[PDB]
Subunit: 129 residues, 2 copies
Amino acid sequence: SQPVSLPEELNRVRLSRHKLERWCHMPFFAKTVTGCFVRIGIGNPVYRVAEITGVVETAKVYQLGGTRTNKGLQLRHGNDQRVFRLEFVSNQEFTESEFMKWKEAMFSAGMQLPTLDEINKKELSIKEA
Amino acid sequence: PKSQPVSLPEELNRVRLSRHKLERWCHMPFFAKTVTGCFVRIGIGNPVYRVAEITGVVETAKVYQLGGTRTNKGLQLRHGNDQRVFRLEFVSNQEFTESEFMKWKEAMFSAGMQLPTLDEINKKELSIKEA
C-alpha cells in the first residue's frame, strides 16, 4: 500500500522508445502499455513523467525508428491529458527532478499516487519470457 | 451592446486560441478557416508577448514538435501594422494581460485600424465552439 516515493520504483514500469517500437504492432499493445509510464519529451528540451492511460490512432502514420505506425499514447501528467506520438518518448530514465515535479502535479490534481503493489503487479504482468 | 468595439481583455479572450488548442486542431480539416480571425498571445522574445490576430496559415521550412505532434505550419499574425509569420510553438497557453491588451489597442489606433465589435467577437466565438 506504500505510495511510490522513488524514481527507481516508478522506473520498474517505465517503457523506453526502443520497447515501444518493438511492441507497437503486437496485438495486445494497449493492454500491455496502459498503466505503464514514459519519460516524454514535450518540446523545448523538457521531459516529463507521464502515465499511459490508453492508445489511440493518430491523424498521420509516421516513422518510429525502423518501423512506421499511426499509434499515439494517451498520456496523463496530473490533470494534463494529451495524445503523444511514440517518437517523443525518451530512452533515458526519469531524473529525480522530473519524478518530484510529477508527484507535485499528482497531489495538486488531488490524484492518488500508485502504490508499490500496483507497480509490482503491473511490472510482473508484462514480463516477457 | 453588440455594435460596440471591443474594449476589455475579457472580451478579446473569447476568441483567443491556446497553444494546446492549436495543437489539438492542427491536423484536422478546415484548420485555416477555423483559426483565421482568432487571436493568439504570441511570444516575441525576452519573456515578452503580444496580442495578435491570425490572418492565415502557411507552410514553413522548419518541421518542429508541437506538443504531442509534428508540424511545419506557421501562423500569419497581425499586430496593428506589423504582419509576420510565427511557428505555433511560440503561442502561449496564458490569457492576455491587461498591459498586452492595452499595447495592442495602442498599435491598432496608431495604425488607424478599427477594433472588432462585440458582435464580430461573438459570431467568431460561436463558430469555433466545440460540441
